[PDB]
Amino acid sequence: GSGNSASQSPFSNPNTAEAFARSFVSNIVSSGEFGAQGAEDFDDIIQSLIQAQSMGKGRHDTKAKAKAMQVALASSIAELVIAESSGGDVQRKTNVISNALRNALMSTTGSPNEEFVHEVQDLIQMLSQEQINEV
Amino acid sequence: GSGNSASQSPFSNPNTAEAFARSFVSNIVSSGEFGAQGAEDFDDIIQSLIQAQSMGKGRHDTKAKAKAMQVALASSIAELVIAESSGGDVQRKTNVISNALRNALMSTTGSPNEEFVHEVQDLIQMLSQEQINEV
């Protein structure tokens, strides 16, 4: 009936989408693992993807097009940990982000939506293989 | 100092930004591999990244967000082509996408930029083999 066949994600409500970054950045700034100075700059990067979720639909939003926003943000967060870490370990220090992301979902939704938390982790490992990581 | 901040991002230029997608999408329909149905869908996600590249600049550049917007675009194409590549293989079919990309950059800037072509194709390999795709 009301709420038919659709992939009901935690981004179906703008407030829930906001709470995602609202909690996630709170983890980072309170930890200082990447500097609060960077954490709130990350908020804007994430913000961009959040805002575009309501923009990049055109008029009719197809299933394959709807989830296109997923990997865009994921691949961004993967680099975010690297960006403000000039000298360190992108894997050892991303542990706080692994916790942060899952904690954010735990607070925003309560669901173990940690598959997205998995996506970024492997993407990090990929990026560090190219010179773009060390420049 | 004077010169530490320089936007070499081609997608910050209205013509150059459009040229990328404009050449990409047209090269797809001229190929007919993913059909026009796919090409006329791809432009919506790609456009969104172009739009947000105007947003994320805000009032001052930060070196983190400057590169964060790069990977976001590649990821927007990575999964996107996989969707219309549902049939077993994704590599030999995204080959024509690599063609389109190669053609696009060659026309848009004239630079090889196959590093970005590799960027898109590499993320494909990971996601297309994940059990979130084969459901």
Task: Concatenate the DSSP letters of all residues of B107-134 into one string.
Answer: HHT----HHHHHHHHHHHHHHTTSTTT-
The rounded Cα B58 to chain-centroid distance in angstroms is 23
d(CA A106, CA A101): 8
| Nearest residue to B115 (alpha-carbon basis) of B129, B107, B125, B105 | B105
Residues of chain B with C-beta less than 8 angstroms from the C-beta of A71: 75-76, 78-79, 123, 127
3-state secondary structure of A109: coil
Question: B73 in contact with A at a CB cutoff of 8 Å?
Answer: yes
A to B CB pairs, distance under 8 Å = 99
Question: B72 in contact with A at a CB cutoff of 8 Å?
Answer: yes
CB-closest option in B41, B78, B122 to A71: B78
- DSSP code, position B33: S
A133 residue type, one letter = N
Token pair recorded at residue A115: 């598959």
A10 residue type, one letter = P
Side-chain half-sphere exposure of A122, counting CA atoms within 13 A: 13
- Stretch (H or E) spanning B74: helix B63-83
d(CA B119, CA A71): 13
Count the residues in chain A.
Answer: 135
CB-closest option in B51, B63, B123 to A75: B123
Task: Tell me if B52 and A51 make a contact (CB, 8 A cut-off).
Answer: yes
CB proximity list for B12: less than 8 A, separation 6 or greater: B53, B54, B57
Question: CA separation (Å) from A21 to A46, A101, B16, B69, B123?
Answer: 7, 9, 32, 17, 24
Question: CA separation (Å) from A59 to A62, B45, B52?
Answer: 10, 12, 18
Question: B60 in contact with A at a CB cutoff of 8 Å?
Answer: no
d(CA A26, CA A10): 19
d(CA B26, CA A28): 43
The rounded Cα B119 to chain-centroid distance in angstroms is 9
Token pair recorded at residue A61: 């939003």
| Nearest residue to A20 (alpha-carbon basis) of A102, A115, A81 | A102
Question: CA separation (Å) from B17 to A24, A61, B13, B29, B50?
Answer: 31, 23, 6, 20, 7
d(CA A46, CA A69): 11
d(CA B56, CA A49): 10
- Stretch (H or E) spanning A115: helix A115-127
d(CA A16, CA A108): 6
The secondary structure of A27-62 as a DSSP string is HHHHH-TT-HHHHHHHHHHHHHHHHHTTTTT-SS--
Question: CA separation (Å) from B73 to A13, A14, A95, B28, B38?
Answer: 24, 23, 26, 18, 17
Task: Tell me if A56 and B44 make a contact (CB, 8 A cut-off).
Answer: yes
Let me know: does A114 contact A102? Beta carbons within 8 Å. Answer: yes
3-state secondary structure of B88: coil
Task: Tell me if B47 and A56 make a contact (CB, 8 A cut-off).
Answer: yes
**Number of neighbours of residue A130 by Cβ within 10 angstroms:** 13
The secondary structure of B34-66 as a DSSP string is SHHHHHHHHHHHHHHHHHHHHHTTTTS--HHHH
| Nearest residue to B94 (alpha-carbon basis) of B40, B18, B42 | B42
- DSSP code, position B24: H
A44 residue type, one letter = D
